[PDB]
């Protein structure tokens, strides 16, 4: 006999121009808990597998991993509807899964095979899904795009919101400040989210930002700072920020304090600008998955043995996906020119000299 649910304390958010923030208590059901645990573990194991495949040279170019930040993608999804919108930068494999793509499609995209979610056209940085707009490789560029998606939610009148994510490094891009001003001016249902993992590539927050209170950089935009290692903190803050945008009050900034265990990308060992001890300590004391596991077990929502059975099932899902991604064929060369334009008749695309022609179909 497990508990059907339990009540948990969550850290109080720091507030900027808000007289009240998210609650400091929440109820988690056994059912929701097993779900979040499974999703976070699936993301973690997917990322570890990508690291493997990269080292085996089955993935190339960019591979930015989100391990350590699983309370963010899973917590954010836990606080919004399937009909809400989300856009992020290139560290997107987790959000690609939480917004509903399979591990198979994600890994086959990384391995550059036709079974990929973009048929091997996009690679790590450019994956899309229903109400998930990438997967954006130019730092900060996705922020005005998110505000525009929020503009469309308001135009269409269906009470949908858009979560618009950028990292700490991105936070110093001028277009983000341009977007804050217009979102405030037009009361756009845009939730600006700074995923603060302490480093923008190799540059710590203290060395890039004159002020490292990201949740206050919106200035006239209200903000909250949230513990992004705690899936329940993230979920509560997200529910609060979405209710805020749905009520017509306009945009809000949420800073998620989180941490990446890997380097900036597969090419960055991740240790010239921080210590291995720093990383180990974060992981040892505030890993998002161990934090939930402890909560569930100690409140009788689930057993050590249950969670271990989920781990075994996730491992088989990740192994199956990896086998598919490594055996699936590359896309056929004849499709090189496909999908340049939407809704157009076929045309020809010039290859490497004038005698090479590729058919382009929409």
């Amino acid at each position: 006999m497990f508990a059907n649910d339990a009540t948990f304390e969550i850290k109080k958010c720091d507030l900027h121009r808000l007289e009240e923030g998210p609650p400091v208590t929440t109820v988690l059901t056994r059912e929701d808990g097993l779900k979040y645990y499974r999703m976070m573990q699936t993301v973690r194991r997917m990322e570890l597998k990508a690291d493997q495949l990269y080292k085996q040279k089955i993935i190339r170019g960019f591979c930015h991993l989100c391990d350590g930040q699983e309370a963010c993608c899973v917590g954010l999804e836990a606080g919004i509807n399937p009909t809400d919108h989300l856009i992020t930068a290139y560290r997107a494999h987790g959000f690609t899964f939480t917004r509903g793509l399979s591990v198979r499609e994600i890994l086959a995209e990384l391995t550059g095979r036709k079974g990929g979610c973009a048929k091997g056209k996009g690679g790590s940085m450019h994956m899309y899904a229903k109400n998930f707009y990438g997967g954006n490789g130019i730092v900060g560029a996705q922020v005005p795009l998110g505000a525009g998606i929020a503009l469309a939610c308001k135009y269409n009148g269906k009470d949908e919101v858009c979560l618009t994510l950028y990292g700490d490094g991105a936070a110093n891009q001028g277009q983000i400040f341009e977007a804050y001003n217009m979102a405030a001016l037009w009361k756009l249902p845009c939730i600006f989210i700074c995923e603060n993992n302490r480093y923008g590539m190799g540059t710590s927050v203290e060395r890039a930002a004159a002020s490292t209170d990201y949740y206050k950089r919106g200035d006239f935009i209200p903000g909250l700072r949230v513990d992004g290692m705690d899936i329940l903190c993230v979920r509560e803050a997200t529910r609060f920020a979405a209710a805020y945008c749905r009520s017509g009050k306009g945009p809000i900034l949420m800073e998620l304090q989180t941490y990446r265990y890997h380097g900036h990308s597969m090419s960055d060992p991740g240790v010239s600008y921080r210590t291995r001890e720093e990383i180990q300590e974060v992981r040892s004391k505030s890993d998002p998955i161990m934090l939930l596991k402890d909560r569930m077990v100690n409140s009788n929502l689930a057993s050590v043995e249950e969670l271990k059975e989920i781990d075994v099932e996730v491992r088989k899902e990740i192994e199956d996906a990896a086998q598919f991604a490594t055996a699936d064929p590359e896309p056929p060369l004849e499709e090189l020119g496909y999908h340049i334009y939407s809704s157009d008749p076929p045309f020809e695309v010039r290859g490497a000299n004038q005698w090479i022609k590729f058919k382009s179909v929409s």
């Binding site: 005005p144 998110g146 469309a152």
Partner: protein, 329 residues
């Protein structure tokens, strides 16, 4: 009747706004100010705040907002006050809009239109005179058009809006107040000009003269002068920069054996360069009885002083000179 270029663009936008509630216009001074060059006059009064949106001076930001809205299914028309100021926003045009359908494997279309005046005007100097036709033309995933007369501007703005992909419409400030005969077909709300197709504005046997935007009217003047001397120019209005209609230009050259390109932009890696290289790689090369040559803006940042500016943009006499050089007359 006669309709000015500015009014034909206004007509096109008004019709498409009425036809589809998802279409909207944003940019600096589009709404309450009736447009920086009055191209959007009366639209805000007719359609309201939701549809005709005055923006802060935040080009990257509002271009990005427009691209996001198009991704979510809206059909924005994003005005740059001039294309000079598009440089601030050019990453959004090229990396967020142009490349997205391809990167996504055909999952995410981007039905956005960027429009605004492009090129030289009168005494506006070097930061405000630059032509971006070859820059935008270079880029896969974009369509790029450059209207000359009232018919061109209306039909191409309507086609741009109906297109499902990013369309750059390179207008011309000096053309805006020019009136043209506007035939019945053009006055209709179903009037569309296909993107990708040039138009022969004057039939000729002696030489093919190819241009885009304002200089098309200078080519016709040049041909009117030359005709009195027994020289018949075939004048081609490109209309589209990408994808350009090379077949039309080829068929003309096979008839006339001679080619001059005319553009207002800077010469090197310009529009004329691409036409010239295509004509040499293509089936028409052996039909040339002389080298193809280019008439362009002078290769300088645009000077302010009248006599300097006059000599920095192609004049009718420079088009005539190039033509007579080509014909050896």
């Amino acid at each position: 009747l006669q309709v000015t270029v500015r009014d034909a663009i206004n007509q096109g936008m008004d019709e498409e706004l009425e036809r589809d509630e998802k279409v909207f216009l944003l940019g600096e001074e589009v709404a309450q100010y009736d447009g920086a060059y009055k191209v959007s006059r009366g639209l805000w009064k007719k359609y309201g705040d939701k549809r005709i949106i005055d923006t802060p001076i935040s080009e990257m930001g509002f271009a990005g907002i427009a691209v996001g809205a198009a991704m979510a299914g809206l059909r924005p028309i994003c005005e740059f006050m001039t294309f000079n100021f598009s440089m601030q926003a050019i990453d959004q045009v090229i990396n967020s809009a142009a490349k997205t359908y391809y990167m996504s494997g055909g999952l995410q279309p981007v039905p956005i239109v960027f429009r605004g005046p492009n090129g030289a005007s009168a005494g506006v100097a070097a930061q405000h005179s630059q032509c971006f036709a070859a820059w935008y033309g270079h880029c896969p995933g974009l369509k790029v058009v450059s209207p000359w007369n009232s018919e061109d501007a209306k039909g191409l703005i309507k086609s741009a809006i109906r297109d499902n992909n990013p369309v750059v419409v390179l207008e011309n400030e000096l053309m805006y107040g020019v009136p043209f005969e506007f035939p019945p077909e053009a006055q209709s709300k179903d009037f569309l000009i296909p993107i990708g197709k040039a138009k022969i504005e004057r039939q000729g046997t002696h030489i093919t003269v190819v241009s885009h935007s304002r200089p098309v009217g200078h080519c016709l003047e040049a041909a009117a002068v030359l005709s009195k001397e027994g020289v018949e120019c075939e004048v081609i209005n490109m209309r589209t920069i990408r994808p350009m209609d090379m077949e039309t230009i080829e068929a003309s050259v096979m008839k006339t054996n001679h080619l001059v390109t005319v553009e207002g932009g800077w010469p090197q890696f310009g529009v004329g360069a691409e036409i010239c290289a295509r004509i040499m790689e293509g089936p028409a090369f052996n039909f040339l009885d002389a080298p193809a040559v280019r008439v362009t803006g002078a290769d300088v940042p645009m000077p302010y002083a009248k006599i300097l500016e006059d000599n920095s943009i192609p004049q009718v006499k420079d088009i005539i000179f190039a033509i007579k050089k080509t014909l050896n007359i």
